């Protein structure tokens, strides 16, 4: 019924409902752990329960894949100054528990999976074991970006330092994901 697999999925297109014994709605930009596949659906696991979703509703992300690499400096022109200038301040919080992280990156109102930081156009992404896994960050100078790295697709992935950058061209947002 399912092929045994391990990978990640990103709710790039919008919120998603994970079908299970009880259904579960996850916000736009959620990082989801894929545990199986079958032509029509992904098996995904969230908080140690199995759910299922149709493949077209999440963007498939394979960390083992081959991607180009670029430093942060060559990318910072196209990332919002708010995060760019202070990149190491934010990344400083990565891989830490949700309750610790929200002590300093404070949200207006805490929520699971994806959390807006107060007074910033930045969202925090919580992955497995409720640890900070990455950020949703605005894109600047799109037209200048897409012809600098010769990007032709709607969604562009690259390695960068300790992590990955995923550029959703249509929504003009970056997802930085680490590990």
H/E segment holding residue 86:
none
| E-assigned strand segments in the chain | 3-10, 16-18, 24-26, 31-38, 41-46, 49-54, 59-61, 68-69, 114-116, 123-126, 132-138, 155-160, 163-168, 173-177
**What is the chain's percent helix, strand, coil content, to nearest 5?**
15, 40, 45
The per-residue b/e assignment along 77-89, b for 16 or more CB within 10 angstroms, e otherwise, is ebbbeebbeebee
Residue 54 backbone dihedrals phi, psi, to 5 degrees: -80, 135
Solving technique: X-ray
On whether the CB atoms of residues 52 and 60 are closer than 8 A, the answer is: no
Q: How far is CA 132 from the centre of its chain?
A: 10
Q: How far is CA 160 from CA 58, 69, 70, 116, in A?
A: 22, 6, 5, 23
Question: 132 is written with which tokens?
Answer: 């900070």
Judged by DSSP in three states, 159 sits in strand
How far apart CA 15 and CA 27 sit, in angstroms, is 5
Instruction: Locate the domains of the chain by residue range.
Output: 1-64, 65-179
């Amino acid at each position: 019924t399912y092929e045994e697999k391990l990978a990640y999925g990103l709710a790039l297109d919008g919120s998603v409902t994970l079908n299970g014994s009880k259904d579960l709605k996850v916000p736009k930009y959620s990082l989801i752990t894929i545990t199986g596949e079958n032509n029509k659906r992904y098996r995904v696991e969230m908080n140690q329960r199995r759910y299922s979703v149709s493949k077209n509703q999440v963007f498939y992300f394979n960390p083992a894949g081959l991607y180009e690499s670029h430093t942060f400096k060559k990318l910072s022109p196209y990332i919002k100054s708010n995060y760019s200038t202070y990149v190491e301040y934010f990344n400083s919080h990565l891989h830490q528990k949700h309750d610790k992280v929200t002590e300093t990156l404070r949200p207006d109102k805490d929520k699971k999976y994806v959390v807006p930081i107060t007074q910033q156009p930045i969202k925090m992404i919580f992955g497995d074991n409720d640890k900070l896994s990455g950020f949703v960050i605005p894109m600047t100078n799109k037209t200048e970006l897409k012809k600098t790295f010769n990007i032709t697709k709607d969604v562009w992935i690259t390695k960068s330092g300790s992590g990955y950058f995923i550029a959703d061209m249509k929504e003009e947002k970056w997802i930085y994901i680490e590990l």
